[PDB]
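Note to self: the last two entries modelled the partners one at a time, which told us nothing about the interface. This time every component goes in together.
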Amino acid sequence: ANHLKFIARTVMVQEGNVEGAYRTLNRILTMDGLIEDIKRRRYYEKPCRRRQRESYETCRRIYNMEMARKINFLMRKNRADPWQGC
Amino acid sequence: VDYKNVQLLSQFISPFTGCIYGRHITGLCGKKQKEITKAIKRAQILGFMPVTYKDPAYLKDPKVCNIKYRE
Amino acid sequence: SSFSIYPPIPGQENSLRWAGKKFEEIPIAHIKASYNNTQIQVVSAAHQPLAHASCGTEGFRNAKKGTGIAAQTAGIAAAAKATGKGVTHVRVVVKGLGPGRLSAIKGLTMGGLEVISITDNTPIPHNGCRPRKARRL
Amino acid sequence: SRYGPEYKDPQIDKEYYRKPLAEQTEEEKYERDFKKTQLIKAAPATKTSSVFEDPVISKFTNMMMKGGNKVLARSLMTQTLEAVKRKQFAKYHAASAEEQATIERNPYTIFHQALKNCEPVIGLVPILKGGHFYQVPVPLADRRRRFLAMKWMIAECREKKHRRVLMPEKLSQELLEAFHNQGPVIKRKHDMHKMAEANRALAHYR
Amino acid sequence: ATPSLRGRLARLGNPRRPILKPNKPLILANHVGERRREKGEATCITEMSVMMACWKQNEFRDEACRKEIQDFFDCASRAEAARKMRSIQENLGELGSLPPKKLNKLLHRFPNKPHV
Amino acid sequence: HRFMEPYLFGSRLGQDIIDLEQTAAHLQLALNFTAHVAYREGIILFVSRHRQFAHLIETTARDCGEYAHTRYFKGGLLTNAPLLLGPGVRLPDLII
Amino acid sequence: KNILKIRRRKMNHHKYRKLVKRT
RNA sequence: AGAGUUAAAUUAUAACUAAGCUGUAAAAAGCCCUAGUUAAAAUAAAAUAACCCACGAAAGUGACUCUAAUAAUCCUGACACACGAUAGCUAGGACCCAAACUGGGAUUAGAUACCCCACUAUGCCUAGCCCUAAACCCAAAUAGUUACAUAACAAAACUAUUCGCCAGAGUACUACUCGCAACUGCCUAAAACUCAAAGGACUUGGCGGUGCUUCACAUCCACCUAGAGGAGCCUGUUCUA
Ligand SMILES: [Mg+2]
Ligand SMILES: [Mg+2]
Ligand SMILES: [Mg+2]
Ligand SMILES: [Mg+2]
Ligand SMILES: [Mg+2]
Ligand SMILES: [Mg+2]
Ligand SMILES: [Mg+2]
Ligand SMILES: [Mg+2]
Ligand SMILES: [Mg+2]
Ligand SMILES: [Mg+2]
Ligand SMILES: [Mg+2]
Ligand SMILES: [Mg+2]
Ligand SMILES: [Mg+2]
Ligand SMILES: [Mg+2]
Ligand SMILES: [Mg+2]
Ligand SMILES: [Mg+2]
Ligand SMILES: [Mg+2]
Ligand SMILES: [Mg+2]
Ligand SMILES: [Mg+2]
Ligand SMILES: [Mg+2]
Ligand SMILES: [Mg+2]
Ligand SMILES: [Mg+2]
Ligand SMILES: [Mg+2]
Ligand SMILES: [Mg+2]
Ligand SMILES: [Mg+2]
Ligand SMILES: [Mg+2]
Ligand SMILES: [Mg+2]
Ligand SMILES: [Mg+2]
Ligand SMILES: [Mg+2]
Ligand SMILES: [Mg+2]
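The predicted structure of the combined assembly is written out below.
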């Protein structure tokens, strides 16, 4: 309101197509996390529900990043085995 | 760190939205991450730097953050 | 061909024109996209309202106006009324997240109007007013 | 299904075999066909390599047939084409030069153009959502469009004809009405289009 | 970088209050989860809309504009071919990732040890 | 493993170093026991579930005249011997 | 499990509150 | 704990445009002193940072600044003293938004519920009470160990000095006492009577209007054909006889 207009959350189209700039804008809001913020601020969530959701999200993030680390560690063993029928 | 230098505080801020990046994007010691957060918020309240956007005069600063916006 | 996403600053000496006028001279398309309705208004650069349309004005009714096809027809009709008043380019701004966002933008595209910039100005409270309670108690 | 999965549908058209040497890929296709030692089904009793048959005529006669009377359905189609031809000849003889140039007398092209203007473009499906059934427009397959056209023709000329008016002259009259686009089947297709635009807003439920 | 796990769980040696309360224990199983099938959405909506635009504008005559009918039929054929080939192509190809069966075989070859 | 600390000499930059004085002291007794159990006409079985040397264990046992199981060990083989192998089976006297 | 004991105490407290309100 | 301040929203109220706005799986009710855009006090709450784990004894605390400040040369310890989330009470003020209760509109055989609309106490500040929580991390405080050792599950098993508790289950966060600004309240807390169990953790089936994949090929839908249920007759039942 008090700020200057049309600087924030603004992308410009290239060569006359708007759908690509729209997916660009949606990626900006997605990495900034604003999309889930608008989904979660449609209704009110109690602080107990907020704490449970943050604990669940932290647990899932820890498990997923550690599992992806294990996949990236074991990716070099996906080659064909040299000792078949030994 | 300082609250008077807008450029250093605004490098760690998203250009389109004005959000403050976390440790996984910024990559600091926790002491400096807390000092950057407090210095930004002091500059936000005291009127030295914009809230809703990055100040466009410092738009072309070198990128220290590891977030990639264009794919 | 160095293209910048960021807008041409009013204080800067950047030289980009669309049909002879500067960047802040171009009219504005406010797109309020709610979960049940989509209201479209094109206004001038001096914030004088040029034309207005909505899904209820396009002859749709209550559950029919929440879908995207009503927002698409609203974008086509609003771009037709904007072309009737004689505007070529418009800067479009979207308020709120709804199912008719894509449909409103492409309706404004297909209705005989050109867009150059899209700004998402969605009301994001910094923990301000308390919203209503959640469903399914 | 007394035929196994290895058996395929036969190719009946003579011009596919009689001029093979002008193209390479369909050649390579059929030496694959008879060098895989693949089993071919027997030819069906309806389809034949005659040039006077036509497949939509055959399908329409198959839908003409009630019970198992093939010869009765073919007789009804024969008198229907005879009635169409003789009605067009009587219309030809009573006209001037420009209308005689305008009028087409071939019942095969009349039948084909009647079904091409007769087939519906879009269709409706019932979908259950929130404990209620809603009609939603869907794009239809080409065989389904042709089938709906055929079924509407048989349904009208079976139902609202009189007892004294005969079945082939009635279907000839409806063929000419569908050719001139003023038929009640064309009105029924338009009514389906009315319901499709009335339920256009429900198309996101698909 | 993995988020820190010090002082999070509820243990006897922890002096501070618990932060994270897991429903199930934080143990890597020897298998990964299956991929989620993408929820389908409606197709040919814009072509259907301009098709209805001709129908309402010209009172349901196909002879006025046939280009959008040809485009709608092409859209339907393209959607049919896309749903024919994309189901086959998304089953095998995982882009830079690996299919879950071979991931399960890899993690069964290299298991996790909660015991001993 | 926690049982290898008396058998470890030390750690070299995170890598375990095994004391070969203790290895030789164990290996003299092990080779002497193997020689004596082969002297007293016993059944000797070489087991190594590792698919990088398995052919070499199997050829080693073929030249030794003793027996080898470098493949998958079935569950009730040594335990439920008469059902798996035969009606009267003499069990192996030593396994390496 | 313990929900049976909890529900029994709940029913007892609800009945006692209704008794207090009625008398 | 005081004192000072407001960025994102939101609103009272004005100016242009439109005839609709809100509302859901779908609808009605409500509002048309309405909706959109531009300007904006007061009140309330403090996105991102936070994938951080700090402060406080606990409850609790994460918008900014300043002031005062976080006991013990550090063992345990009450019925004594001092605090104690939300909800609630007396008086004064504030009231954007949310909302018990209530009134309408849906749903249902019924709906004084789940869904929608509006509004009140209340949620906010000052001053005094009330002293209750799944106040739980169901794991007491202070010094230590990885020796012996797996009822089951869960957060591995345990030494030394203390403090408070535990004697079958229902009756029973109850009756009657003491004390308390509490008077539909809190704390302490039985018995008569009934039963031979009340319980905690597991194993395997069964089931699920719980979730995720692959399906149904006359089989559920989309969908094809011919019939039944309407008429007469044959024939078999059920009822009367
Ligand atoms: Mg404001
Ligand atoms: Mg309300
Ligand atoms: Mg509840
Ligand atoms: Mg502490
Ligand atoms: Mg649990
Ligand atoms: Mg009871
Ligand atoms: Mg105060
Ligand atoms: Mg109404
Ligand atoms: Mg006011
Ligand atoms: Mg804040
Ligand atoms: Mg201290
Ligand atoms: Mg003490
Ligand atoms: Mg209190
Ligand atoms: Mg209060
Ligand atoms: Mg009030
Ligand atoms: Mg009511
Ligand atoms: Mg608590
Ligand atoms: Mg307790
Ligand atoms: Mg104690
Ligand atoms: Mg067991
Ligand atoms: Mg007792
Ligand atoms: Mg109580
Ligand atoms: Mg009492
Ligand atoms: Mg007493
Ligand atoms: Mg069937
Ligand atoms: Mg019959
Ligand atoms: Mg019948
Ligand atoms: Mg009958
Ligand atoms: Mg009978
Ligand atoms: Mg009988």
